[PDB]
Amino acid sequence: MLTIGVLGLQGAVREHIHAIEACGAAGLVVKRPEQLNEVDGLILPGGESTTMRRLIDTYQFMEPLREFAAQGKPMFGTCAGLIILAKEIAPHLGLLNVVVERNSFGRQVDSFEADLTIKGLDEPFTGVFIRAPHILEAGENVEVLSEHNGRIVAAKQGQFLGCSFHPELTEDHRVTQLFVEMVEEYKQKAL
Incomplete structure (x- = not known):
């Protein structure tokens, strides 16, 4: 069985x-780069991309994350992790071909x-948005899974999955x- x-x-x-456990997979909290060899896919979560990036540098995760991708292993950037996986205008990994802007709403109106409606899901899905990044543009290689008021909020590209809401802050897995x-x-x- 799978480890994510x-x-x-x-x-x-x-x-x-x-949520991983609820779907019948084993979950592992990845704190060190070597542990990437122990999983079949990776969620990149977090709330604070700048903080997250500084730590990624500190713990030397960038090149391991690039090698993980090169192995074909799926990667799912949610909320801040979307920033880490994708591109900005115009660093981080630049693996998912979407340009992302950080949240600009103040703390009292940011949620x-x-x-x-998400492609692959029948009934609507309650998206939880908290300082959501905004996808400004998606490349031609990117499949849009969900849009809300004209903005792409979930996207897929091969092994890569990205969304701007918190799919784990709900009991809907x-x-x-x-x-x-x-x-x-x-x-x-x-193989």
Whole structure:
């Protein structure tokens, strides 16, 4: 069976692990780069991308994360991790071909929920947005999974998955399951 990592340098990880476990996979909190060899896919979560990036440097994760990607292993950037996985205008990994802008809303108005139609899910999914990054543009190689008021909020590209909301702050595990299916799909093809 599958093991999915959650990068554990910064921010909350307990809910992501719970969601992974709820989908029938094993969860591992990844605190050191060598542990990437122990998982079949990786969630990159976090709340504070700048903080997260500084820690990524401190703990020397950047090149291991690039090698993990090169192995074909799925990676799911949620909320801040979307920033780490994708591009900015115009560093981090630049693996997912979308340009992302950091949140600009103040602390008293930076959160909302919205019911989303997500490709691959039948019933709407309650998206939890908290200082959500904004995707400004998606490349031609990127599959849009969900949009809300004209803004791309979930996207997929091969082994990469990204969303700007928190799919783990709910008891609805259908978005995590989409990711688990990508990992299962990698696991089947892996030689």
